[model samples]
Target: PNFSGNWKIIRSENFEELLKVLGVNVMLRKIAVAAASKYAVEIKQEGDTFYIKVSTTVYTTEINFKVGEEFEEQTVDGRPCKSLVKWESENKMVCEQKLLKGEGPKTSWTKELTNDGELIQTMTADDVVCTQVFVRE
Candidate 1:
């Protein structure tokens, strides 16, 4: 069940505007968005734990969590996103997240491994959905 590999972004839908909705305004927000093909995700699995590292052209965010467990992440803007991940099926993980600060919508996302071993991540919020496809590097 170890999916430890570097995943290069192939493409993404609605990801750009998602940045506009979030923090993409000032130089601070610039830390967020980028070209669809310009990002990379490194997933590391140790024993029964999982760590997802997401990198853009500038910075990287590393998240460590376990399945079925809720965790709080205090981001830069401190939107205070609370998330819980669980296994929907073998090789498929689903995470439900909500913003705990200010006015924001609840979001749900999923990571699925294809038979061809491609990693597909889907993020949904406020009727907007974006699927980011990645290939092992």
Candidate 2:
């Protein structure tokens, strides 16, 4: 269940809808989707601390966190949020984000490593859902 390797996105579903649910502007949404085709990630971990570096044609950012600890995050789409990561099981990690400024539905996501050796990244906002699949690089 250790997700400490480089990966490349192979496919995505309903990603634009998820961006809309997050209140991202249309222009940014376009950029996000355009960049999705070449998305990549490098994950590394040392003990309980994990670092995830995401790269796309439009931007790149590294997100690091310790399990069960809450931290402030400036999301890739420009949202400032209070984020927390926790383990749901040995093969799945769930992350939740709440807006820092106002009342809004929390954003929740899970990164699960399947038995088939694929990394599934699922994001949920309210009732909207987006899923992206990754393969080892």
Candidate number of the best lDDT = 2
Q: Mind giving the per-residue lDDT tens digits that candidate 1 earns over 28-130?
A: 4344444346889899987657998887777678888888889876433346788888998888898887777676655677889988878989877567677
Report how far residue 123 has shifted in candidate 2, in Å.
Answer: 1.1
Backbone collision tally, model 2: 0
lDDT of 1 at 72: 74
Clashing pairs in 2: none
TM-score of each prediction = 0.81, 0.90
Q: List RMSD in Å for every model shown.
A: 3.1, 1.6
Tens digits of lDDT, candidate 2, 44-84: 97767989998887678888899899988765356788889
- Model 1 Cα displacement at 32 (Å)? 6.0
